Each structure stands twice: as C-alpha cells, then as structure tokens.
Ligand binder design. Sequence first.
Ligand code: G1I
Length: 281
Amino acid sequence: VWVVGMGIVMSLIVLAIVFGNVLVITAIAKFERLQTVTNYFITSLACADLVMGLAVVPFGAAHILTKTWTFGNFWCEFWTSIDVLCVTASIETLCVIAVDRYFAITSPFKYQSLLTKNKARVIILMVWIVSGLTSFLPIQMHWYRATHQEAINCYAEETCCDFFTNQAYAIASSIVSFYVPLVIMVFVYSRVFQEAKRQLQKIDKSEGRHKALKTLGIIMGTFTLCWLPFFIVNIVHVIQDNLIRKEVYILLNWIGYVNSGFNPLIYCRSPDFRIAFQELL
Ligand SMILES: CN[C@@H]1CCc2c(ccc(O)c2O)[C@H]1O
C-alpha cells in the first residue's frame, strides 16, 4: 500500500533532473551569445548531472523497490564506480566555478591572462581524469574489499549487492572528494564578500544622497545541506562499528542525490539565459 506512491515521486525526480539538464545543455549549444570561456564549466556540470540522472537514479530505484538486484555481479562494480565518478566530478566542477569567479573579482586587469579558450579544455580534462582515476581504478581491480566475515558472502553471492568498503578507501575518497572543495569555497567566498563589502562602503561614502548575503547564503547553503551529513556519517561508520544502521545511510545517500537537480535552477539566472529559455518555448 506504499510501493506505488514512492515510485511516482522518484520518477518525478528523474523527470525533473533530466529535463533541467537537457534544457541547460541545449540552451548552451543552440545560441551563440551564451558561449563564453566561463560557460564551459556549466556544460561539464550539466553533462555530469545528466549522466547521474540517466545511469544512477533508475538502477537505485529498481533496487529499492524490488526485493533483489536481479542483475549480474559484473554490473554492481560498474554502477558504484559511475556513482563515485559523477559525485566527484560534480563537486570538483563546483569548486572550479568558485575559483574562476574569485579570480575574476580579485584581479580584473589580469583576468584575461589567467583564463583563455584553451585553458578551459585543459582544466576540464584534468579535473575529469582526476575524478576518473579514483572511481574505476580502485573498484574494478577490487582494492576496496573488506576482511570482515560479514559481506564476504555478499561479495560472493550474485543476488546480494550493497556497499562495503575498507578503512582506507572510505576516508581517502571522502578527503579527495569533499573537504578540499569545501575549504577552497569557504576561503574564496569569504575574500569575495570582504571585497564586496569594501566596495559598498566606498560607494556609500562617495554618495551622500544587504543583497550579496542572500546570494552567498543560498549558494553555500544548498551545497552544504545537500552534501555535508553524508560524508560525516560515511567517515563515522568506518571509524567505529555499529554506529549507524543501513536505512539511515541509504536515505542520506539518496537525499544527497537531489543536489544535481537544484544546480541548474541555482546557477543560470542571467537575463540572457532567461531570454534563451523563452526562445526555446
Ligand atoms: C553507494 N554510493 C556511493 C558509495 C560511496 C561513495 C559515494 C560518493 C562519493 C564517495 O567518495 C564515496 O566513497 C556514494 O555515492
């Protein structure tokens, strides 16, 4: 009396994510005015979110709704690697989108030298290859297996499929994928806010007859609320045993996946993007 209802909501999530991603990608592709050296990162983020929505959510929904995996043992390592790759790529793309804006605000005269047409391609290939180095390599070669008697059968059994990681690969992946982008964002956005406050003070002193707080607050809060608890609990259950159950872990993992849907709404707000979206329909 409850399986039917949840499926509708999860399918709506899938539809919203895919619709937003496709709309952003086609808006960037069709119109020449939107092409900019700082818009390639948006394209990469949209592609990563679309890959997440197309190859991550449906399999998880099928696994959750149905009793058993009902697929081969080979596909589980592919699915987990795809999830890890997509999450890491999204996080690092967000970090780059923060870094280039910090460079633009801090030093405007030399902003042209730092970012060029070829630089975006190089940085995107580098960031994606770093994301893929930690996804396929340590999973496809079975470097993350655990020594516990529990889940040894799960590795052996083709029907069972759930995440069980060693002590290293959990903390190492968390450090690589979450904490460094968070620190970089915090520092650069604090500096940007300081510069904006100084400029506002100067103009208010010049003209003898806020607003950035809302933007910075939403930008930081969406990401933090979406991705903070999952990595904390990921660290803790490996640090100590019997700390959590599995249902809470799965629920936090699923609620972390909704971030990719909100990013197109959060990021594209310029009048040019609105005019383009109007021109689509
Ligand atoms: C079960 N899904 C995976 C499992 C572990 C993991 C995820 C995301 C980023 C990481 O760095 C991870 O180690 C999750 O999306």
